[PDB]
mmCIF file of C-alpha atoms and ligand atoms in Angstrom:
data_model
loop_
_atom_site.group_PDB
_atom_site.id
_atom_site.type_symbol
_atom_site.label_atom_id
_atom_site.label_comp_id
_atom_site.label_asym_id
_atom_site.label_seq_id
_atom_site.Cartn_x
_atom_site.Cartn_y
_atom_site.Cartn_z
ATOM 1 C CA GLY A 1 9.349 27.605 4.831
ATOM 2 C CA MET A 2 11.101 24.708 3.463
ATOM 3 C CA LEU A 3 9.359 24.764 -0.445
ATOM 4 C CA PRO A 4 5.858 22.718 -0.341
ATOM 5 C CA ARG A 5 5.881 19.621 -3.249
ATOM 6 C CA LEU A 6 2.755 18.770 -5.003
ATOM 7 C CA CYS A 7 1.377 15.275 -4.912
ATOM 8 C CA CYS A 8 -1.140 14.293 -7.015
ATOM 9 C CA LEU A 9 -2.587 10.471 -6.301
ATOM 10 C CA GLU A 10 -5.501 8.850 -8.110
ATOM 11 C CA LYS A 11 -7.648 5.839 -5.827
ATOM 12 C CA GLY A 12 -7.809 2.950 -5.958
ATOM 13 C CA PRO A 13 -10.114 0.300 -5.146
ATOM 14 C CA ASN A 14 -8.481 0.445 -1.126
ATOM 15 C CA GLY A 15 -8.664 4.107 -0.938
ATOM 16 C CA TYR A 16 -5.318 6.160 -0.808
ATOM 17 C CA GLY A 17 -2.850 3.535 0.941
ATOM 18 C CA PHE A 18 -2.087 6.771 4.353
ATOM 19 C CA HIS A 19 -2.962 7.705 7.895
ATOM 20 C CA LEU A 20 -3.916 11.288 8.832
ATOM 21 C CA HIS A 21 -2.514 11.662 12.244
ATOM 22 C CA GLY A 22 -2.350 14.628 13.783
ATOM 23 C CA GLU A 23 -2.028 15.706 17.448
ATOM 24 C CA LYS A 24 -2.700 16.160 21.191
ATOM 25 C CA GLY A 25 -3.581 20.380 20.957
ATOM 26 C CA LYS A 26 -0.795 21.556 19.268
ATOM 27 C CA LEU A 27 -1.678 21.786 15.227
ATOM 28 C CA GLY A 28 -1.432 20.512 12.529
ATOM 29 C CA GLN A 29 -2.002 17.430 10.062
ATOM 30 C CA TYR A 30 0.246 15.110 9.434
ATOM 31 C CA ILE A 31 1.238 11.932 6.402
ATOM 32 C CA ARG A 32 2.059 8.757 8.020
ATOM 33 C CA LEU A 33 2.848 4.966 7.449
ATOM 34 C CA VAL A 34 2.929 5.646 3.727
ATOM 35 C CA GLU A 35 1.436 1.502 2.944
ATOM 36 C CA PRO A 36 4.226 -0.164 0.513
ATOM 37 C CA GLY A 37 3.197 -0.076 -3.776
ATOM 38 C CA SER A 38 -0.255 1.939 -2.736
ATOM 39 C CA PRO A 39 -1.139 5.076 -4.797
ATOM 40 C CA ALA A 40 0.215 7.765 -1.538
ATOM 41 C CA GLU A 41 3.517 5.971 -2.017
ATOM 42 C CA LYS A 42 3.747 5.809 -5.844
ATOM 43 C CA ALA A 43 2.865 9.659 -5.518
ATOM 44 C CA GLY A 44 5.696 10.031 -2.997
ATOM 45 C CA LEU A 45 3.932 11.093 -0.069
ATOM 46 C CA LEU A 46 6.457 10.480 2.568
ATOM 47 C CA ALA A 47 5.207 9.948 6.563
ATOM 48 C CA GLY A 48 6.116 13.285 8.395
ATOM 49 C CA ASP A 49 4.580 15.643 5.621
ATOM 50 C CA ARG A 50 2.826 18.116 7.003
ATOM 51 C CA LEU A 51 -0.509 18.077 4.977
ATOM 52 C CA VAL A 52 -0.784 21.655 3.711
ATOM 53 C CA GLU A 53 -3.354 22.279 0.671
ATOM 54 C CA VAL A 54 -6.549 19.293 -0.309
ATOM 55 C CA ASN A 55 -6.959 20.183 -4.586
ATOM 56 C CA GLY A 56 -5.999 23.725 -3.841
ATOM 57 C CA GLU A 57 -7.622 24.679 -0.350
ATOM 58 C CA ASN A 58 -5.178 25.229 2.458
ATOM 59 C CA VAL A 59 -6.104 22.747 5.673
ATOM 60 C CA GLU A 60 -3.750 24.273 8.221
ATOM 61 C CA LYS A 61 -6.609 26.220 9.795
ATOM 62 C CA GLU A 62 -9.232 23.581 9.402
ATOM 63 C CA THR A 63 -9.645 20.270 12.574
ATOM 64 C CA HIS A 64 -9.121 16.868 11.765
ATOM 65 C CA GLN A 65 -12.691 15.649 10.476
ATOM 66 C CA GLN A 66 -12.332 19.202 8.102
ATOM 67 C CA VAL A 67 -9.387 17.333 6.668
ATOM 68 C CA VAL A 68 -11.009 13.691 6.185
ATOM 69 C CA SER A 69 -14.334 15.218 4.646
ATOM 70 C CA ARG A 70 -11.679 17.164 2.082
ATOM 71 C CA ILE A 71 -9.707 14.554 1.242
ATOM 72 C CA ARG A 72 -12.879 12.078 0.983
ATOM 73 C CA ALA A 73 -14.676 14.218 -1.057
ATOM 74 C CA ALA A 74 -13.018 13.683 -3.840
ATOM 75 C CA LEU A 75 -14.275 11.355 -6.474
ATOM 76 C CA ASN A 76 -11.503 9.409 -7.736
ATOM 77 C CA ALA A 77 -7.646 11.843 -6.863
ATOM 78 C CA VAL A 78 -7.004 14.179 -4.513
ATOM 79 C CA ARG A 79 -3.886 16.361 -5.049
ATOM 80 C CA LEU A 80 -2.299 17.398 -1.400
ATOM 81 C CA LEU A 81 0.553 20.129 -0.869
ATOM 82 C CA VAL A 82 3.371 19.304 1.967
ATOM 83 C CA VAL A 83 6.269 19.991 3.297
ATOM 84 C CA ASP A 84 8.605 17.634 4.227
ATOM 85 C CA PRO A 85 10.260 16.746 7.537
ATOM 86 C CA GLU A 86 13.313 17.653 7.331
ATOM 87 C CA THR A 87 16.677 15.119 7.469
ATOM 88 C CA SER A 88 19.437 17.034 8.668
ATOM 89 C CA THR A 89 20.242 18.148 12.244
ATOM 90 C CA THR A 90 23.473 19.198 13.912
ATOM 91 C CA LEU A 91 24.289 17.521 17.378
HETATM 92 CL CL1 CL B 101 6.736 18.196 8.105
#
């Protein structure tokens, strides 16, 4: 598996500046819409990142709502372990 990567975000006055987005039924939570100039951008989060841990807790087997709660629970910073999306494919 692709080496996961740690991103350490510091919460700003409007939060972190990303969307957390899941799928229909197929399990995973993904980062989308990393806002320009945001704490998420500065921490190196990328659209399409799959979220594996929040503050050291594996969240691969938690619901969307639970993962949101884990991120919001953190008072002013959050550590996100992600797996980055593929960038090379042979056709
Ligand atoms: Cl990914």
